[model samples]
Target: DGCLSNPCFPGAQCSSFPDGSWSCGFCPVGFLGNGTHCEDLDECALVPDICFSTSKVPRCVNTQPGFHCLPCPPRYRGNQPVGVGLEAAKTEKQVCEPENPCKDKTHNCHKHAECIYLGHFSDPMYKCECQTGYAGDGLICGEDSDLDGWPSLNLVCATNATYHCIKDNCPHLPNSGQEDFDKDGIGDACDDDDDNDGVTDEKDNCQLLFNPRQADYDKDEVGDRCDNCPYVHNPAQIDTDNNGEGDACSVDIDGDDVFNERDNCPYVYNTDQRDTDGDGVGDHCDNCPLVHNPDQTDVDNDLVGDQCDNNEDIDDDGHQNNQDNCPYISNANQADHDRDGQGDACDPDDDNDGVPDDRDNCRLVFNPDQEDLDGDGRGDICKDDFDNDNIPDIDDVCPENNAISETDFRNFQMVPLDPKGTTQIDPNWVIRHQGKELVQTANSDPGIAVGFDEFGSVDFSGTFYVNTDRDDDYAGFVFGYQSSSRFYVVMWKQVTQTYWEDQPTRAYGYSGVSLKVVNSTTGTGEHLRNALWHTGNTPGQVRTLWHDPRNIGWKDYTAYRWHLTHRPKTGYIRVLVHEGKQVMADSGPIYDQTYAGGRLGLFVFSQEMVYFSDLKYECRDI
Candidate 1:
């Protein structure tokens, strides 16, 4: 009933599932498809070379799915694997000294026993022996002991007999004809597998099929031998069209997904199936390629099939016959840093540094030096901050030093800075011209507040006005300052007190606008500038550059704007003080280059309620 309509290929088997749905069996060897129709696989040109036809002479023969090997059509060699016939290494010399005893037919051997070669060193040529299942001399082989159609050995007559014999394909059985298929020496009746395919007959999808290349497109274990849907997986072998192809693959002749009747190129794959020529023939097989002529008419008829047969350049890269340098791409600039003719856009190496652009440091400029000074892995030439110093290396005087600058541009507006302990900054904010004031409330130790920003040859201006009545101290500006022991200060005492007289330098005091320098001299005078700042002076040396003992101290509650112009290169220091548009005090030029550009601060020695504001400066240093 299942095979009633013969829904299968020529010799394929058919059966029904539990649901009464019929299925086709695997086709025979050398064929592929459902039980309905099978196509032969041409292994010769369809697949990669399987023979050593190059150096050796045994040529490849297309036997569909089952191919057999023969002696040298001119044979040669290989210890290497080249499919079946491809491994033709040792022979070709004598065509053989009788390669095989039975198959080469150079023996007087019997049909019941198998022949074994005895080598060129000995006589007999080959050893004709009785089959394993039977016991008798090979020359007089007979007796079907197991009745399995093969013969037993002739032990008594074998030693001297050298006559007619039949080789035992399956020696363990009794007597019958030796019908060998696939030409593999063993008989098909008792062979573990009729075909030489690796799979055993017990579980083979196609038991008798022999296709060396075991390819299963969708991998369902049922090889192409009986696959109804060759490209798609359908192990049940159900065919809708009964044309041997499964449901979808049935109408899809070329396996390109489009149905056969409507497929633009039915014989081959053309997924982009379109009609540019506006005809039923798609451009893929239209013969004229990419031009219009729907009727397929030809004038000269040279078989390009058209008056305008076009098929050349791709991707519009301006180069023809694949001279694009970089295949399938369009890069006009053609920047190949490695200079290998490939454009950088598609080039893997831009610097030719033995490394790809993506993985190479300083890739573009080609510094394969791989020197990462700061251990950041960014090569020296790759980044501007090579030394890991926050400052950039390009315009830096060093791969060192973290010196910064603060222009102080209108930073303060003559107000007071917040003082420590029971003290306040710009206490009342009552002064109309006040904000961000630097105040001195320590009442001792030269309340110093400096802008740590470094500078040299700079112009600095500030507004200073004392609000407290502690007129016994002095107040002024300090420039080119570093620490308490090193700097330049111009102080104007309201009225001088016993400024020193302790620990002894200049135990006398004076009042006036004076310019003095305190230094930690690598060389200097010890008794100098001692009476100017500290009572017992620092352990470092101090000096007095210029000073005058005059009572020209500043007034209380009055504003004085000090303008300082310093040029370290020329050791020039100029000072000028402005009071209501009038020059209240001035310092002629003091030339001292002991200390170059440092910091600037508001200085007060034993003075309080000092507010410094409206500070600003500009630098000319690189």
Candidate 2:
């Protein structure tokens, strides 16, 4: 039957009143109820006595008709005299002295709850229920502690009340299976290993072993003698950085990737040293570091620049303006007239003429014919040398008359210049060669410096403005070169005809200038030069002082202008176009020939249109 229906039955006891229930206890002695039923006592005479003294009862105390109290023997007395005196007074007296049945004094029933009494004969003994809080033989007692296996006190065992501990042992009581403390009824047998360790309470020192592996030991619940790291849980035992490390042993209580053991600053939580430069490179690698640029970029090649302004493509052109002569403009083709620092590829007036110079007949000197007849130093329109002198009519200062002067001591100065200028330069241009700012000019106002070297060769180059409108109609300059003492030059106009608008005409009008060179001691002239003018000049001609158009190149007359000069034996003519460089071009090894050094100046002889800005020596020997 289920415990719910009946708690006790048959051979078992219903010790107390209620026949069944958890309350029914074992049926004790001296009772009629043996558990199932009850019966009356027959009072068997053969059984041991339950009475204190039989004679103490009245001798004539009638037992229903046949029972009687017998008298005591010799030394024994109980309320009556024995033998003869016992017969007479059996009905009168009832006093009797009882015998003491104790063995040692009071049977030493000191703290024992059982009484001191005689068992079978007079041999002494003691028997009684042990007193609460004490346990042992009848003579001795001890602390009745549940832990010590004595009776438990105060903390009674309720069917439901539980006892838990780190180390446990329940003895003598019904196991509740909580015996091993499986009471939590969770993981079975040893399951309530609160620490989750596989070791069950029955055998585990740390009953709540948290780690399923039974990791911690030492009853401290932290395994000892069981781990390399006694207090921690290092499973793999990996030391990646090789610091004799075990992950569990590390106290990175805050998982910031950097463990406390290895991190220099273990406490402050930083997942990443994002601001490496301390300037905060949180998002940008290019933090302006106080010392070194972490981004490692250098523009301007100076090594001192920020990320933003480093690379300068100053002009919108594909090429970086800083390196281009014409930065603001594009000139993949480097074109130059005087073939100087100016880029004729983009220069409207490459020849530096008041006109674009492209169409200027005299790209180097001021001339109107834009014409070269005898091509000596005179314009056909003004070369009226009545006496035919090396000096042109325009530069004759003394017309038809000849003057000779052989002195080398003469004043040297350049034609004055105007300040207003217009020029475009590359942004990255490092003006290191010369400190002078090259300005652009409109008219022939700022005449350039023209000088001859000790080697007797003249060089001319400088800045200029260009105009592109009129085809070959730009105004500029042209000059005549005088070398020998006896020489004559003539010029002619190509356009002719008189009656009709377009007809051939004869070379009629003529003009010339004369020059004389004396020995200083001789009165008469030893050599003379003449510059004559007529209607026999070519398309591009300039008769400033003189001109002999014997040599010219492919683009010399139409496409680009010219800068005429000679180079010394071992020297080089280095040309720079628009801040960019050009290869050096060399002449000859002038083996022998004494050179004559002289001054060459600009002399303008014009009728209507001619312009010039700068004409200067652009190179040196040293």
Candidate 3:
């Protein structure tokens, strides 16, 4: 806060410069500060705009540093205030205030009004009031006696107080045909969408406002109301899917078990209801119905159904069925096995053995004989037995023998009874010669054939009852070959003491079957020692096949058929002991080829009792 310092102007007092110079400060009107006194500023000299280019002159209001222009009087503008650049608000100063120019001139009211003060400058506004039925807000009235016309005609006065024509002298009016309508004041013929829906009346959204027939969903001339299937315009209505009839009428043609509403294959006709193609759909929905052919086309009408066929190979086999040996079967190269100029039976070689009968030597044997022998060369063979011999040459050592061996061994030849008609039991054939009774009855249907070699065996298990009194019984066989001197096999049963037991045994009988072969010193004499050794060893391995024509008491020979096979590899023999069942045996080694090519037959007599049958042997390769 410093004390006020005074730097007074040349024409002013210091106190007046600081505060008291109200009217004394700042130049007014046309004056300027020329250092000491106020001087007049020339407005015309510093600025232009004295006259407008339109040839109208202007007046100005000059101030201390500037001046403003004034507009011309009411009838004219661009004068005094405007030329000097003063804005409208300040230009009021140069206006001739309250001077009513039209006041004395009294406008011709034509019986409608009175004069009033206008807004500014020279003239007052003259407003007229019409006698009802007229317009122009009291300043003017319509020329027509009837105020009902339009626009400038003041046709009707609005009822609302805020309206421009409210309380004004305008009349209520009704529309006349002669007058333009719709408030746009144009004729109806000129208006589009006379209803004004943005569409031309010619192309109106509702064409025949009076009629409803032409309603179209497509809005096309083809009215949807008249269209059979309004939404779709199918001209021919062809049901491509073979649905019952026209696609337009039939809801679901394909009998997919599902009606049109739910069936995806509404058009096709299908009955098996199978969806072989597995499209979650029935065959009708599947493109390929037949053959599960999904591709759905044998487009060329070839027998090969589509969905799987490549055009050329309808059967999908490279060769057509006609040219194929097996039509349903595949043969790409058209290969025929026999090459007989024929294809299979479909080649002439009905047996398919590669030899066609037309060129087969043994047509029946598939021999390139080239002619029909048995005619159908399906060669095959059958085996038959000419002789009832148990030996088949294929497996027989000496098939010509046609002989059978005796199962049970019994020797009666050299052991005649003493007056008791009883014979002694041979040491051979004796399972365990302890003690047993012996007796027998003989018959011819089951006769005995006896042979004696130096060495042979016999069974002596008896088949009789024991008694104190002497008894005569006979049954058993003895065997010997070559010479009868060296050995004899006695198979007999005897009845001895109170403790009854049977004796079936073997012995080196002094002058029996084996001794004869020794006397002859012939064919198998050398093997005599082996036979003796065998007979010497009692109750060893022995195989027997037998049958009793009589329904005799049971023995191990219940078997109807028996096969005693001698070893082929070692001439070892297998005793196939079978009853009604199959063969079973534990064979002995081929210790004797003497028997290999030897003879076998029944050698029988009796003291012990037993019956036999089923004597057979199979000589296989040794």
Candidate 4:
């Protein structure tokens, strides 16, 4: 504020003089400015007599706002006065000149002190720092003890000249607990080779001993000299178990009593050394360690315990011996009727029959056939008055009335009865022989043409009366039927038109025995028939002819009987229908032995009220 009120030169400031008046005061040091805004003043610019007015042999330089006085050039150093005396030069002007104050007794440095520049700049200050083989500052240099090279820098060090320096200069006794190469107890100050690793410490990567090649296997920054685990990298140097060993190279991975070098399972804990086979491998993973088979040979391919074997069926029975009633014997049926531990095949008298011989007359041939002429305790087979009838006559009227036959036939037939539809039969049907015929009428669906009795093949024949004169109506039999999806049909169908809308140039027949395969898997039709038999005029003319002929109307009340025979050798079956025409419908080898034995029955399709009678099936055991 004082400089703002009173104007001043750029290099001066407004200040009160010793005379008590306001004036512009020169700014101090290293600047230039107006009076109102003073900056640092350059004192070198105001020096009018630099080098004594332009001789310039000696130079004058600026330092901050002050000036530096330089002595005469090196050309005059030899000729300059080399001595000074404060008393002889008491009234003389001091100049920038060279003089040896120590030689002239004008300095206070010790007698043996060495002088040196103590500052980094040209306006240097000189000091007589103590020389080598001496101790203390120059003003009071003293020889303590032998004074052997700076009194050894008095550091409580483990060793002197240790490796691992904080700086490349190696100054000061290093307190960092690193190695000292020289062993002088002065620490590694200015050392050349601290670790003595053949190379100088400044160049050797591993400055510590024991690492001559400086090889870093894990490439961690610390070299192998001090690295606890030299092989692997753990820069943190973590010793998990605190055993002075790094976890990376620990002998035991899991802190168990086993050493990895000898322990069979190194990573796991098996302190008992439980090797079942006494093999080097531990039992925990010794595949076949038990039987002295070091190759772990699993001859039977079981999970374990193959010293014997794992033949699934040891007795060569169809059943696996693991769950077999008689594992060592051939008891395929596994009948254990008496609930004893032994199977029926292994137990000779499984029914607890008292008769020990082979000829036992019991239900399972296990009991005795006793004979008693007139009496109690007789075998049931030999009883004459089993019904309690009095007239024995040497023969009772109802001798076997109370007896039941082993072969009992419960006659419950699966037949399509009445005009209403009967859909299907239960799949759990068993075999039954019938003295009377069971007739099945057809429904709206022709694929439902019987023969679903089982999923095998058979022979079928039936006599059917055509109750309708409609052209497209059919009555027939299905043979070799597996599902509604697969079967062969010998349908006697009526076709009326010579030229129908679907077939303008051909005629359809009065009937056909379509050796069809309703490949429900791939739905399609293979119609193999003879065109010449449309009129029912010939018996065996066309042996192999596929045809679509004109429809010829069929007459009502006309009867026919069809017999379909499936011979084993022929690829296709022979279909024969006996009417007044005696036609053998040529179906030209359809099935290539694909279907052998299946359900067989009769059918009528498409609103045809056909009466099918005399349905006969004679299934021969193949």
Candidate 5:
């Protein structure tokens, strides 16, 4: 045979043609170059940020086709292994003396001393320790997990071991065998995120602990704790200043240690809260640092101040400060409407009236008595006042109000779906402005859409319709999704049916709109109970808060509007469905708690070709 001699390497295959022309196959996974001269692949050199690190930096050691991120063994230095990369192996090898000082029988360690293992890769792998309680260099007596070399606070640790110890980052706490959640080298005792669940201790709802599934039952940015405010979505914990009566709630919205009604700078913490000008406004944020100007009036809307804002020719009217009639006002024309000494902008009273600007109800028309037909601020001159409220500005919330309006429903991120959830949903989403489509697919499992931030008061509304009219499916809004297994959703179904018969009985999917909380231990939690449900013991611990009657369900291709208003303060919620002026359903201001703020999502179940448009949302002051 022509290929009997075997001209290929171990990783290569030999091929022989009918004409007896033989050649070696392609190189293997871990090798490169031609089959005859294969070389090892360096995976570490390719990926820079492949490993995690804290204090003791992570080392990426290059293997054949793979790379391992590990600490240097015993006395070893950086990355290079024993027999590879330049003269690095011999140069970097630690080669511990006695190899293992603690483990070895011929060591200098005292018989009474306890030997601590430093590391096999690092220098001097063993260290002899004397116990603290027993006291001595012969010492194998101390029991310190933190190993701060300090005696227990209970010994000289102030009052009954409760004393906060000095010279210790962990302060009188067990340091050894403690958890390293991020493995950052900083133990849990001193680390900010002790449990390391991405949330810091100061803001963690479940402080001093990490819940694998952070379940926020009240949906108020706080997990459901067995506390007084468990049913209420009071993320503030209902006690701003818990110093006085432990349970009595304080009225401080900002949690800045100052009562809401008393703090001068109430919204945020202002350490330098000095009112320099004697004005109510704090000097740090005050426009006028020197002069007392409560009205904060700026004539030309510039640095326009003499008693307050001091600097430059604010008007930019091409005139010197002393020469200009209206020092801070913009009066390029210099036209006098009432032949007064002062210009219009600087005039304390326009129309030559005897009233000051603030005192005059109608300064332009000379209403000396400051008459006001409908009492409020400013002169009763003219305003459209369309909505007939206290003050109603025209145009959209996208401009007038602070609202997030998205015409193109594209900028969306997807969360991890359940094991049985649809894998094809990724390429299936047709992201566009007018009619964003969730294209049809084989798997009918739930697809969770993620693309929103946290908010205390929310008004989320949108329009939706199905492209495929015939197929029975689900379309809804998913919110408070901190984890795949724990989320809140209000889903609409096309028709009611008992589809699958698994074991004991069949699964039932009811028609109409239903509000549900998903708390499933099973991997198939992404798929809802209504449509394209997966087969598993984990049918999910789905708690239904509300649902419309079976007779009142969804129509095929008809477009519908949905509105959901949620306030975390009182756990108030409102779910409404309407078409133009006609109301379909309205669950007025009902109090329901699940999870306050996490993320927002669009949900699709069985039927595909679902179209959603004009996704709008707004969050007011919390």
Candidate 6:
């Protein structure tokens, strides 16, 4: 039996051998033991030389069983300082390798940085060094610590020979040959004022010299310490004339007899100093100086030998061409006869006449009073007939009037008559007839034709013709005609009337073209009497009634057939009008009327001229 209850001093394994003796086997990979006892192994003691190794073997770490190994391989170390002994081993076990801590992404180095691993006595430590063109710690390069004409502030990470410094840090090794000119802790490349002077190097004119108050007699950009000609502007410092003096300080740079201060062609060396114009400009530089053409323009090519031809006028006018109204003509007075801003000598029409030469009957004539009675645009003096009438002057009746129509009214004027024995004829009822059409040119009273005897039941039909230009007027036939005080007329009026409380009660005052019925009396107009007054003609009393034209279409027309009927047997009055069989206007049925029979005639009332023709009427016994 093996030691199963307490196996081999807490770490070692126990087992039985073939000889029947118990032995602990190989110490369970991390333990040191004999046959019946065990102990934990110390790897640091096993590899004592590991502690003295370089960065690759910086530390010896203890593992299970009895083995040892290096934490970081040679040529590498931890990013931070490693702890003193076992702690350093534990840290290395978690994160340790031969790769650089910065390259291995274990350290916070700026992208433009150089990571330096400082050799420690026991382990390794590291510092972040900014790249050549950068400044500040390697973590963030935002400062231009080294002002060496490289863009250092706020730079992203990269390397360049001219922009980035080669050294890893400012305070480099003495044997490294990097300069700190003032022996200050800062490197000379990074020092803002390297000379220990108060002025910054970027703004200092004498960067290496100790002249704080930079002085230069000349106001050029170069300082006196660097300018070759101290009192004059000689940016290139050229001694072109080969004298002891620079060109900027020399009185004559071309070495001519004339001084440079006064010579117009200083570098060319013209010693004659001849000015042909005596205008203070040399002959080589003056163009037309005697003629006072400072701009040197030759407008006309004539007379320049001795230069005394002072003829500046191009048109030979008394005024200069620049001041003359008509520059191309000889107009001394500059008179614009037409006031069109062009002189009379240059104007095409000197009289401002509207007609041109080819069309004007009287050329060079100022007669804008073009009196052509014939309206042929020729002057009246050129036309034979001054009145334009074909008839000779003594034979022309209305000479100034155009003959529109012959005066005839046999078929047009209506002889108005009332059934009550009163006859009305209007002096202003001026109507004319041309062939077959009755034309009403003017009217001062209502027109009514001769009346026929009344009928009990009758049909009144006519072919009414109204010109399309008919206005606010009525042109139609009249039936049941009693007198000026009573009648039934249907016409196309200008405005159609709808029944309201304050509407016009008379047919003449109502303003629409509609099929309206009126039963008039001596008391009042029929339009004032509505459904309320359709009854009872008592003793010494009169009754009137009217029907509003509804659902009827009547407009000013050329010619249409209008028919009105009061059939006593049918007990209704109906109005129908149409072009052919197409019913244009229809009054379905009007059942109200107090008059049974009167007279039939044609009627017209108009404020403007109206025309009517083809008026025919027929009555058939019903």
How would you encode candidate 5's per-residue C-alpha lDDT over 1-622 as one tens digit per residue?
A: 5677777766677788898777877666556658767787664565343433321233456776544555433333344333333223223332213245566654454454567554332223445544322212332232222222332332333343321222233433323222455666555545888667777866777754565466677677666542336565565454433432222234554466666567666554666668877777666545566777766654322222335433243444433365456776644323233457686557776556687755554444455655444333233442222112223222222211122333224446554343343343442454432323233333345666655443445667765656455677577877655445556677777777665535333556677777776665442332334322321223445666667753477776565667787765466778887543246777666775555444467877766766554455544321
Worst 10 residues of 6 by lDDT: 398-407
lDDT of 5 at 407: 22
Off by over 4 Å in 5: 1-409, 420-427, 434-443, 501-506, 523-540
Every model's TM-score: 0.31, 0.16, 0.19, 0.26, 0.34, 0.26
- lDDT string for model 6 (217-270, tens) is 777755687555778877556564656466787778767677886765454456
lDDT of each: 0.53, 0.30, 0.31, 0.42, 0.50, 0.45
Candidate 3 lDDT over 492-581, as tens digits, reads 212211111222223231111111111112212223322222222322222222222121221221222222333312323322222222
Candidate 1 residue-wise lDDT, 425-480, digit = tens = 32222111222235555565444455545555666776666756765677777776
**If both were scored by lDDT, which would come out higher, candidate 1 or candidate 2?**
1
Model 3 per-residue lDDT at 236: 41
The better candidate by lDDT, 2 or 5, is: 5
lDDT of 3 at 208: 20
Residue 128 of model 3 has an lDDT of: 41
Candidate 4 lDDT, 181-204, residue by residue in tens: 556443442356666556666656
The sequence of per-residue lDDT tens digits that candidate 2 reaches over residues 135-253 is 34434444342212122232223233222112222322111122232344332322436334566555554453344455454334444533445655554433333344444566663
Q: Per-candidate RMSD vs. true structure?
A: 50.5, 62.7, 63.0, 54.2, 31.5, 53.7
Candidate 6 residue spans exceeding 4 A from truth: 1-438, 468-470, 496-557, 568-571, 607-612
How much is 548 displaced in model 1, in angstroms? Answer: 5.0
Better of 2 and 4 by lDDT: 4
RMSD of 6: 53.7
Predicted structure with the largest TM-score when compared to the true one: 5
Better of 2 and 4 by TM-score: 4
